[PDB]
């Protein structure tokens, strides 16, 4: 197989391309290889250098098929650690949310929006450290210290922020904060609050009308629910920013 590496087993079968575990036969060094505006993805990946972000190793073409060498995460995905209808222990949820925020802070710091944060894209290494993966929807929202608004609609409807359904153009960062809130709900409740944040979705209307006696909100302790109250605000300008999330009571609660 490709140069020094053997493509042993498949780990992803998506609409982009597939992801294989590449064990080098020499050193035994094991990595992840993805097989295939992919020029766009590559140079975003070369930018990435943070412990809560999938490290890029390098690219290789073979006529028709491109090969992306990235840090392996042998722990699978966060999705796999969420029990349906239950979620996970609140302390594990807090640790993952800490690592997730660190990751999103980094990306935003280098002027990058991921645009498709959800548990399927949050992989774990062997010591259960979270890594933000899949920069195939990722784009630059800040360059030479000037922000550009987004207008491409993308991501996954249950994770997606309301402004993306309604506004012609919108700020990148509140969109990623929003989806982080949906991920936090899923970790604490083991279900997603709504199919879409649209005025035509009952469960979303129920949330705007603060009916937290309904699921999934009633499975969630008052401390994190208060943070979810600040994160899932429909007006992107009133929605909490990451610096202010970092000051939240539950974010700063000791748990084991
Ligand atoms: C299982 N697995 C991946 N799945 C691909 C994938 C799944 C979902 C969304 C996007 C996407 F690309 C990886 C990747 N990237 C991956 C990895 N880097 N290290 C270990 N295991 C991995």
195 and 173 inside one domain: yes
Measured distance CA(22)–CA(1) in Å, rounded: 9
Nearest atom within ligand 1 for CA of residue 133: 15
Residue 122, number of CB atoms within 10 A of its CB: 24
Contacts of 124 (CB under 8 A, 6+ apart): 73, 75, 76, 77, 78, 81, 130, 131
140 and 197 inside one domain: yes
Contacts of 207 (CB under 8 A, 6+ apart): 193, 194, 217, 232
8 A C-beta contact, residue 203 and residue 212: no
- SS3 assignment for 78-146: HHHHCECCCECCHHHHHHHHHHHHHHHHHHHHCCEECCCCCHHHEEECCCCCEEECCCCCCEECEECCE
Alpha helices in the chain, H assignment, sequence order = 39-47, 90-109, 162-166, 172-189, 202-208, 222-231, 242-245
Measured distance CA(86)–CA(188) in Å, rounded: 7
Measured distance CA(10)–CA(20) in Å, rounded: 4
Pull the structure tokens for residue 86: 């239950």
Please enumerate, by residue number, every residue annotated as part of a binding site for ATP: 11-19, 34
- Let me know the angle formed at the C-alpha of 229 by 244 and 181, rounded to the nearest 5 degrees: 75
79 and 157 inside one domain: no
Measured distance CA(49)–CA(54) in Å, rounded: 8
Measured distance CA(13)–CA(8) in Å, rounded: 15
- Rounded to the nearest whole angstrom, what is the distance from the C-alpha of residue 69 to the centroid of ligand 1? 11
Classify 18 as helix, strand or coil: strand
Pull the structure tokens for residue 57: 């190793």
Please enumerate, by residue number, every residue annotated as part of a binding site: 11-19, 34
Which residues in the chain precede a discontinuity of more than 2.5 Å between C and N? Answer: 36
141 and 122 inside one domain: yes
CA–CA distances in Å: residue 121 to residues 142, 151, 199: 23, 22, 27
8 A C-beta contact, residue 21 and residue 72: yes
Contacts of 73 (CB under 8 A, 6+ apart): 32, 54, 123, 124, 125, 131, 133
Handedness of CA 110, 115, 119, 124 (dihedral sign): negative
Measured distance CA(21)–CA(110) in Å, rounded: 29
Domain boundary among 36, 61, 83: 83
68 and 115 inside one domain: no
116 and 207 inside one domain: yes
66 and 149 inside one domain: no
58 and 130 inside one domain: no
- Rounded to the nearest whole angstrom, what is the distance from the C-alpha of residue 19 to the centroid of ligand 1? 6
Nearest atom within ligand 1 for CA of residue 31: 19
Q: Which residue, among 12, 43, 57, 32, has the nearest Cα to 125 in the 3D structure?
A: 32
Task: Give me the number of domains the chain comprises.
Answer: 2
Known catalytic residues are: 116
8 A C-beta contact, residue 177 and residue 239: yes
Which among 10, 15, 19 is the best mutation to test ligand 1's pocket, defined by most ligand atoms within 8 Å of the CB? 19
147 and 31 inside one domain: no
8 A C-beta contact, residue 201 and residue 210: no
Measured distance CA(235)–CA(250) in Å, rounded: 23
Domain boundary among 35, 53, 83: 83
Residues with CB under 6 A from ligand 1: 11-12, 14, 19, 32, 54, 70, 72-73, 120-121, 123, 133-134
Domain boundary among 58, 83, 108: 83
Nearest atom within ligand 1 for CA of residue 16: 12
Documented resolution in Å: 2.3
Q: Which residue has the tokens 């920069």?
A: 135
141 and 233 inside one domain: yes
Q: If residue 35 lies in a helix (H) or strand (E), which one and from where to where? A: strand 30-35
19 and 92 inside one domain: no
251 and 138 inside one domain: yes
Measured distance CA(78)–CA(187) in Å, rounded: 9
Report CA 58 to chain centroid distance, whole Å. Answer: 22
Domain holding 39, by residue range, is: 1-83
């Amino acid at each position: 197989f490709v140069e020094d590496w053997d493509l042993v087993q498949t780990l992803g079968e998506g609409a982009y391309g597939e992801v294989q575990l590449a064990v080098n036969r020499v050193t035994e060094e094991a990595v992840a290889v993805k097989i295939v505006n992919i020029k766009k993805e590559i140079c975003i990946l070369k930018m990435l250098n943070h412990e809560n972000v999938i490290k890029f190793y390098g690219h290789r073409r073979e006529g028709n098929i491109q090969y992306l060498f990235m840090e392996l995460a042998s722990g699978g995905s966060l999705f796999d650690r969420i029990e349906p209808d239950i979620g996970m222990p609140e302390p594990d949820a807090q640790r993952f949310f800490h690592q997730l925020m660190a990751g999103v802070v980094y990306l935003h710091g280098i002027g990058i929006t991921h645009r498709d944060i959800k548990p399927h894209n949050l992989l774990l290494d062997e010591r259960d450290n979270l890594k933000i993966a899949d920069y195939s929807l990722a784009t630059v929202f800040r360059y030479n210290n000037r922000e550009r608004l987004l207008n491409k609609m993308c991501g996954t409807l249950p994770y997606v922020a309301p402004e993306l359904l309604k506004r012609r153009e919108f700020h990148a960062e509140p969109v990623d904060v929003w989806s982080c809130g949906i991920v936090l709900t899923a970790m604490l409740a083991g279900e997603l609050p709504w199919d879409q944040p649209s005025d035509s979705c009952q469960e979303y209307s129920d949330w705007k009308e603060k009916k937290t006696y309904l699921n999934p909100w009633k499975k969630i302790d008052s401390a994190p629910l208060a943070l979810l109250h600040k994160i899932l605000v429909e007006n992107p300008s009133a929605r909490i920013t990451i610096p202010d999330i970092k000051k939240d009571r539950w974010y700063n609660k000791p748990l084991k």
